[PDB]
């Protein structure tokens, strides 16, 4: 009885998107109060991003070279600063639709919503997790840089991601809103590996609890095991280790279903070594790891937030 | 290189949601211009929805018994009418954030975004298809009735669904915005089957083209076949028949990939009779049918709408 991947309402973020052009070359920015945030890649053409010295490139661009347009109206840029990999453009007008907001740096395994935007206009909204190798697996095509990822706590928006790069392997990399990349990546076009993309174990377990809360539980066995026993099977299949913190976090879901966390681990261990054998769980032929335990809590009794 | 299930931006719809209470019993309504639309189930308690005579129940409720609250502010109800399975509440205030909009009735295989709302507050947004048996497979918990489904054509919102019912099997049923149920379902709690949930063939094919546009095409064989040949394998696996209209609609995707529509049918026929054998396509272990060809066009060159 049903449990969709779904994103936060995006209205509060739509009201913050603008178009930023430098060298008539265009991408997205985020307008909060009287500051516009965008990737510092705006000042680059090519070669530049083949070998960019951002400090020297920024030397003789100036305030008037940054063209910021919002809705259909032009913002006046009255200053600018580079902080890590983002440019801050001070404008002389506060965004009168600025929401309550915070800037967070999140953590692999964390989920968030992305509002994919093209030259300042939002076109789609969807969910992802931050992967354990510090990439995300998004849908970003040309002009999408500067699109942001966000969470919400009923009223206030938690901005956690800004899109900068697509690696040659097709996965995506970006920064927090202070301009620091997640993981080892840089805003240049050379060579840079993503490491192993391990499965986020605690999220899979939360999703299995969701599946039970809706009655799709052929996979419930009876076996139990221990943390160490389970983790020894986890390395095998490049699942992230599970620890007590993650057991603790799953507590409310065990409380409600009556299924002990380590018993659910035992079903997962059996599934990893047996494979669905043609069955599905909640409409999926594989084990989904893009739901956190709190995501499940927002649905897993379908009662989000107050 | 990446292709997410993603919904339309929902901001234009968030601005239209209100809370409607009758018999201090509460659900969601849609406020456009000076009319609020909601399920006529608002006038029911239980028994009532066990055996509801809506005409007789509506007799001695009145304008003042309909409590409409939006934001934190109270709307004055100055009239009401029942049209099929929806109630229209005339209020004395136009919604000053009414978007451009149309009311459409869609067609099995059609996709749309749902803004799932709880006592007037939106909590999540996600995509679905209308199934060929006239159900959708949503995520709707208590108080969710009256949440709506919508498309967009750059500026104007196409409202196509209002949520009314969860069947005993766990799937969902509702109406268009004129109050006519999709399929055979009624707003009462007795017995009512959903028929066969066939797979939407033309959508699967569009998604296979998407997979190629991003390079995940081990499944490309070389076989071809005919419409009739393919459909004879389609019945087998309760896929919807494919016809010329659907071939026509896939034309732009064949044009760009160089893969003839019937050649792609031949890969699909091979996949249905061989199974992935442990492989994935675009992160899925099964064949996804919740993308239309035009959905793919909105991404499949990542260039939505103008």
Q: Across the interface, do B138 and A2 touch by the CB < 8 Å criterion?
A: yes
Gap between the Cα atoms of A123 and A145, Å rounded: 13
Of B134, B221, B136, nearest in space to B170 by CA = B136
| A–B CB contacts, 8 A cutoff, strictly below | 140
Does residue B168 belong to the interface with chain A, where contact is any CB pair within 8 Å? no
Does residue B84 belong to the interface with chain A, where contact is any CB pair within 8 Å? no
Does residue B162 belong to the interface with chain A, where contact is any CB pair within 8 Å? no
Does residue A2 belong to the interface with chain B, where contact is any CB pair within 8 Å? yes
Resolution for the entry shown, Å? 1.5
Task: Concatenate the DSSP letters of all residues of B158-203 into one string.
Answer: EEEEEEEEE-TTS-EEEE-TTSPBSTT--SSSS--------B-HHH
CA angle B296, B299, B304 (to 5 degrees): 115
Q: Across the interface, do B141 and A303 touch by the CB < 8 Å criterion?
A: yes
Does residue B279 belong to the interface with chain A, where contact is any CB pair within 8 Å? no
CATH number, domain at B252? Answer: 1.10.1840.10
Does residue B16 belong to the interface with chain A, where contact is any CB pair within 8 Å? no
Q: Give whole-number Cα distances, A157 to A154, A300, B117, in Å.
A: 8, 22, 18
Q: A221 exposed, middle or buried (CB, 10 Å; 0-12, 13-18, 19+)?
A: middle
Q: Is B298 within 8 Å of B250 (Cβ atoms)?
A: no
* Residue ranges in B37-165 assigned as alpha helix (H): 54-59
CA angle A271, A302, B147 (to 5 degrees): 125
Q: Across the interface, do B126 and A4 touch by the CB < 8 Å criterion?
A: yes
**Residue A138 neighbours by CB distance under 10 Å:** 25
Gap between the Cα atoms of A304 and A301, Å rounded: 8
Task: Concatenate the DSSP letters of all residues of A198-240 into one string.
Answer: -B-HHHHHHHHHHHHHTT--TT-------HHHHHHHHHHTTBP
In chain B, residues with a C-beta closer than 8 Å to the C-beta of A27 are: none
**How far is C-alpha A273 from the chain's CA centre?**
30
B305 min Cα distance to partner chain A (Å): 8
Nearest CA in chain B to A154: B123
Q: Across the interface, do B5 and A5 touch by the CB < 8 Å criterion?
A: yes
Q: Which domain holds residue B278?
A: 201-300
Gap between the Cα atoms of A129 and B1, Å rounded: 16
CA angle B3, B4, B8 (to 5 degrees): 120
Q: Across the interface, do A3 and B139 touch by the CB < 8 Å criterion?
A: yes
Catalytic status, residue B246: no
**How far is C-alpha A299 from the chain's CA centre?**
19
A6 min Cα distance to partner chain B (Å): 5
Percent helix, percent strand, percent coil in chain A, to nearest 5: 25, 30, 45
Helix (H/G/I), strand (E/B), else coil: B4: coil
**Residue B119 neighbours by CB distance under 10 Å:** 17
Catalytic status, residue B172: no
**How far is C-alpha A35 from the chain's CA centre?**
22
Q: Is B203 within 8 Å of B195 (Cβ atoms)?
A: no
CATH number, domain at A67? Answer: 2.40.10.10
The experimental method behind these coordinates is X-ray
Q: Give whole-number Cα distances, A195 to A45, A130, A162, A219, B68, in Å.
A: 29, 13, 21, 31, 53
Q: Is A229 within 8 Å of A272 (Cβ atoms)?
A: no
């Amino acid at each position: 009885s049903g449990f969709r991947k779904m994103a936060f309402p995006s209205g509060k973020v739509e009201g913050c998107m603008v178009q930023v052009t430098c060298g008539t070359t265009t991408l997205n920015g985020l307008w909060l109060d009287d500051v516009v945030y965008c990737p510092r890649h705006v000042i680059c053409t090519s070669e530049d991003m083949l070998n960019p010295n951002y400090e020297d490139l920024l030397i003789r661009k100036s305030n008037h070279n940054f063209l910021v347009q919002a809705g259909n109206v032009q913002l006046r840029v009255i200053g600018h600063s580079m902080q890590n990999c983002v440019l801050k453009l001070k404008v002389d007008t506060a965004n009168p639709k600025t929401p309550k907001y915070k800037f967070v740096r999140i953590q692999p395994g964390q989920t968030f919503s992305v509002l994919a935007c093209y030259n300042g206009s939002p076109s789609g909204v969807y969910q992802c997790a931050m992967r354990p190798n510090f990439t995300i697996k998004g849908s970003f095509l040309n002009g999408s840089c500067g699109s942001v990822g966000f969470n919400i706590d009923y009223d206030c928006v938690s901005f956690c991601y800004m899109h900068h790069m697509e690696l040659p392997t097709g996965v995506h990399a970006g920064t927090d809103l202070e301009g620091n990349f997640y993981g080892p990546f840089v805003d240049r076009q050379t060579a840079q590996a993503a490491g192993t993309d391990t499965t986020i174990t605690v999220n899979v377990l939360a999703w299995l609890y969701a599946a039970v809360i809706n009655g799709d539980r052929w996979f419930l066995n009876r076996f139990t095991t221990t943390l160490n026993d389970f983790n020894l099977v986890a390395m095998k299949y490049n699942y992230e280790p599970l620890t007590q913190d993650h057991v603790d976090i799953l507590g409310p879901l065990s409380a409600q279903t009556g299924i002990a966390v380590l018993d659910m681990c035992a079903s997962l261990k059996e599934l990893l070594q047996n494979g669905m054998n043609g069955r599905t769980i909640l409409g999926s032929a594989l084990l989904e790891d893009e739901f956190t335990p709190f995501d499940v809590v927002r649905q897993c009794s379908g009662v989000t937030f107050q």
